[PDB]
Amino acid sequence: MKYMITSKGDEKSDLLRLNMIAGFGEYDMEYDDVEPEIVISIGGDGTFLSAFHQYEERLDEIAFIGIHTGHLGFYADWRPAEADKLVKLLAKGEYQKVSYPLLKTTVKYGIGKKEATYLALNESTVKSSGGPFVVDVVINDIHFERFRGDGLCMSTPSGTTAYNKSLGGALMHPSIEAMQLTEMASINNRVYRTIGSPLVFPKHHVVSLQPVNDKDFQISVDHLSILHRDVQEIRYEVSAKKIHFARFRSFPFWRRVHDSFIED
Amino acid sequence: MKYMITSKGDEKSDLLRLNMIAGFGEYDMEYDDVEPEIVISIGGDGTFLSAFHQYEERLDEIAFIGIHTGHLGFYADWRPAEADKLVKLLAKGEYQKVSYPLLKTTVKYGIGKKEATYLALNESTVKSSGGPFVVDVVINDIHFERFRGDGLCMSTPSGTTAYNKSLGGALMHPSIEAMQLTEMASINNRVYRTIGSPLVFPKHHVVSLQPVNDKDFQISVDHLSILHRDVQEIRYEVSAKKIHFARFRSFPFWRRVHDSFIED
Amino acid sequence: MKYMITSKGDEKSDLLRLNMIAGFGEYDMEYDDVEPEIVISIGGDGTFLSAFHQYEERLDEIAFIGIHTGHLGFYADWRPAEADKLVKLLAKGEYQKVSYPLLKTTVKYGIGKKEATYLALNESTVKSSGGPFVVDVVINDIHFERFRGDGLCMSTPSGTTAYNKSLGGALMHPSIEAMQLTEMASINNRVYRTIGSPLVFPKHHVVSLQPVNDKDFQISVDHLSILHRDVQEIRYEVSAKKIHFARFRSFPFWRRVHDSFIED
Amino acid sequence: MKYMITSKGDEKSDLLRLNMIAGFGEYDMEYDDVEPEIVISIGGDGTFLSAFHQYEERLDEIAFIGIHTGHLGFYADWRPAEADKLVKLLAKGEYQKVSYPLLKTTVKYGIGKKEATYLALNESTVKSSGGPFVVDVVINDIHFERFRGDGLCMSTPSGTTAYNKSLGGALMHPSIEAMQLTEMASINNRVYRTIGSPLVFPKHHVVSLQPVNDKDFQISVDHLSILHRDVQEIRYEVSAKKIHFARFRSFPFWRRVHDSFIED
Ligand SMILES: Nc1ncnc2c1ncn2[C@@H]1O[C@H](CN2CC#Cc3nc4c(N)ncnc4n3[C@@H]3O[C@H](CNC(=O)CC(=O)NCC2)[C@@H](O)[C@H]3O)[C@@H](O)[C@H]1O
Ligand SMILES: Nc1ncnc2c1ncn2[C@@H]1O[C@H](CN2CC#Cc3nc4c(N)ncnc4n3[C@@H]3O[C@H](CNC(=O)CC(=O)NCC2)[C@@H](O)[C@H]3O)[C@@H](O)[C@H]1O
Ligand SMILES: Nc1ncnc2c1ncn2[C@@H]1O[C@H](CN2CC#Cc3nc4c(N)ncnc4n3[C@@H]3O[C@H](CNC(=O)CC(=O)NCC2)[C@@H](O)[C@H]3O)[C@@H](O)[C@H]1O
């Protein structure tokens, strides 16, 4: 069917992209970067993340495929030397799709209760713009804790191996429809108390962050960091939307984890 | 219907038990500690754990209710002063049942491949009997890591607020059918490498521990610690069985968590 | 001798300051905020920190005294109700001085090797201005590690109970002339490796941070955060300078720690 | 002068020992395992630890030298292929001694206040024999905290890279005369509170552990684990004694750390 290819932009990835397009020219494959059904990303996890966000409004109609040109990427599970077999297998089709959960972030402002939403494949974080970060943490309309620290991180399953991981979070299998909240350097003395442990939330649970004094927050969705002013609320929930991968061979998540962290 | 009552054994819990039995004598409630349908536990979480294990072969036919006589217990969500309202509400019935996942541990030995299974409500841990603890960690028949340390802990959801928590694990809502593995003081240098992060596993994933040199392990299921010799394998999976609680009012898990750890 | 008094600025602290000045008017005590020998800080730890930095060029000739108007401060070990006894004891003199180590940060730039130094009582941190933070860590001219993460924190002894503490650092007694380095969310996979553990350095050891790609860093000394461009090197060492406290009664550091973190 | 050689016991270490003895036979070097001045350890860190404890009553008259036959040991900073140069350099003498602090553990019992002391080069730990571990932590006769968990670890400087490290402790340079206390899986809820952070103590500070209910503790000094009954107190302090190493070339501690943990 229709397809397109994003590239990291170096000479290695651009050449691999050009050879794959020439390979695809020998089948019933039309290049179309407007409404593709197959998106191929050539580079690292960052390149894959940009591919996902470029097409986040057609997630139900796209299958993603990652090729890593350097060190093994987590979302990129094909090596450059296998690109010929990939073109051939992909042209035939009969591939099986695998779906990973996603995270929805909603930012409500004051003056009109204006509201922006974002979809994350790795995580969504909040920090303070300059001053101290203080926020009230509400779970399903229940006041859970007042958080003082450097920020918070809300991670998808497949994002738990990213940044969640460096903050002490747990790695969880992507078949679990959930989101995980981790703290960044929480203050804990006799006056200030937080839970400490990471928190894993099921679908339909809503985590809401509410400003205590300062209302300016730097919010990061995957790789893009946006400043927001006069914030009234930040809402987190497991998204109804899902990212679909094309799979041509078993590469189990824990094998993926073993290779990226233990030995390869 | 039929019911029974376990007690911590002090004068406070025994008296509360005797008054509740006298209260139950004024309804259509028969005391039967052989085949009850309602098990009431009076004491702390340990007392509740013993109640669960005493009746672990009739989990499908029993609803559990916890009363805490001292500090708030996690499984005991009724205060002593509410025992009259409990007797009355429980006598009427029309209560809603809530189910939490459980963990199954299987220990296979050498010589006959003899095999013992255990059901845990908090967690199941492994340690070495004396010598250094070394074990190969296999996930769904894939060799994941060689673990060197003091031991490992496999936790249920409702167990993540217990001991999992002190080992750095994440707290996860009991609606998530999963198990979480945490490390006890893993060795990590240039020669010895483990994942570090806790691991959360979905239903039907099988974590298997295999002895490397020493084959004697002290295994703990909730509160009981048993020594096993000539161990060939330890298998962990989310159990098919579930513990059922009787609920007469909303006490949300995160409110339970807030009260036990933040403030009350 | 000569003295001055800083205040948090609220009505409580300003009134306490005015009453202490009137109390000091009945002794041989001259108010002089240019060249004092006694600096009294009225407020919290932040107020004390500002008092220290305001007079950091006369540390050898000043003794500091902290009064906390709200929650117990760590550097402020006098309650408001004891201000009369403080004025009286302080007027007599015969007090014993206690000295805490300090940290020296040196920032060398390109183009002229221009160089700025700062003195910290809590800690000095480095972060990236926007982009990813990557730095080579050199200890006494030995390349120790390439650090990838959110930043680093270099703490004094008395600063280890502050921010060092929230990053997993150890609390160390101020009699130990040392500095402690902690990581902020280090990346650790198969390609990127850091030590993980905090590092404690003796006097005369020099920790040097060197930019790898990006050369813009947001550097924070205690409470003030300054952006630096075209940075070539950041050097850390235990300072030759020391902060001196006036002590009128034993308040041991571990008792101070117990009261601020365990119970009071 | 006089010397002796301990060996791991495998064919590699025994042969290396025999060749070094034959090499030493060509100088003014007498073999004497009763009162040596040079102790050479051939094996790993465990072999070195046993060498240290075998001669712990003559620490002031002995210099230690480590050769590692397998993976790089931390106390063994010579490779097997350098044994000839070692024999030659060691025979000449004119070597410089380097001294590391040590830890003293004192166990007082009931009935006669009987008292045993131990010297540790790595660490000394306490655990419970079977039941739950509960202990009151007293610092210089000040009640600091009631600890509930799996145990505690008191580490020397050179021991902080060992086991202290796996418990979250800081790595500190051996020139710092100090000891570091780390927790094993402390319980922390609304009723039970510990400090959490590791604690670093200077010389002359005395940490004392006092039983709360159970008085039986399994105490481990380096590699030997001894059970003690009717314990009244466990006292920790930096020892007056020191271990002396023979050094023939600069191998800085942080280079040693880099090679054992970062890359080699
Ligand atoms: N303190 C932090 N610690 C750990 N991760 C962090 C930290 N801060 C941000 N991140 C992650 O970076 C993503 C953004 N990256 C793009 C990426 C990525 C990614 N995704 C996953 C995943 N799902 N599982 C396992 N490894 C993953 N990596 C790996 O991550 C590395 C890339 N990061 C950087 O070096 C810094 C950066 O920010 N770079 C920009 C591009 C590479 O090895 C890549 O294969 C943020 O979304 C945040 O998750
Ligand atoms: N290092 C450890 N850190 C933390 N927890 C640990 C540790 N070692 C064992 N455990 C837990 O103890 C359970 C066994 N306990 C019985 C209990 C319990 C329990 N269960 C939960 C839960 N699900 N959520 C939240 N708090 C919980 N607590 C609370 O736990 C305390 C009781 N523990 C002890 O003081 C020690 C003990 O072992 N005592 C025996 C009886 C009480 O406040 C109780 O309300 C082991 O199963 C292991 O989970
Ligand atoms: N993620 C962090 N976690 C922990 N501490 C952090 C974090 N980020 C910065 N800091 C510290 O703040 C100091 C700056 N503060 C002034 C302060 C302070 C201070 N110093 C010590 C000490 N030596 N020991 C023990 N508690 C201490 N506190 C206590 O700290 C609290 C004040 N912090 C804030 O709420 C935020 C802030 O930044 N506020 C500005 C004023 C109060 O309870 C105060 O009694 C930075 O220097 C950094 O150390």
Ligand SMILES: Nc1ncnc2c1ncn2[C@@H]1O[C@H](CN2CC#Cc3nc4c(N)ncnc4n3[C@@H]3O[C@H](CNC(=O)CC(=O)NCC2)[C@@H](O)[C@H]3O)[C@@H](O)[C@H]1O
């Ligand atoms: N959970 C734990 N995590 C980490 N360390 C632990 C743990 N439990 C005990 N220890 C240490 O073991 C010493 C006893 N060991 C002998 C040893 C050792 C040693 N000392 C240092 C040091 N000072 N710096 C850096 N690495 C060190 N190692 C390295 O340690 C490894 C040996 N350990 C084991 O595999 C297990 C064991 O116990 N084995 C017996 C012999 C080897 O790579 C060795 O080069 C206990 O004293 C305790 O410190």
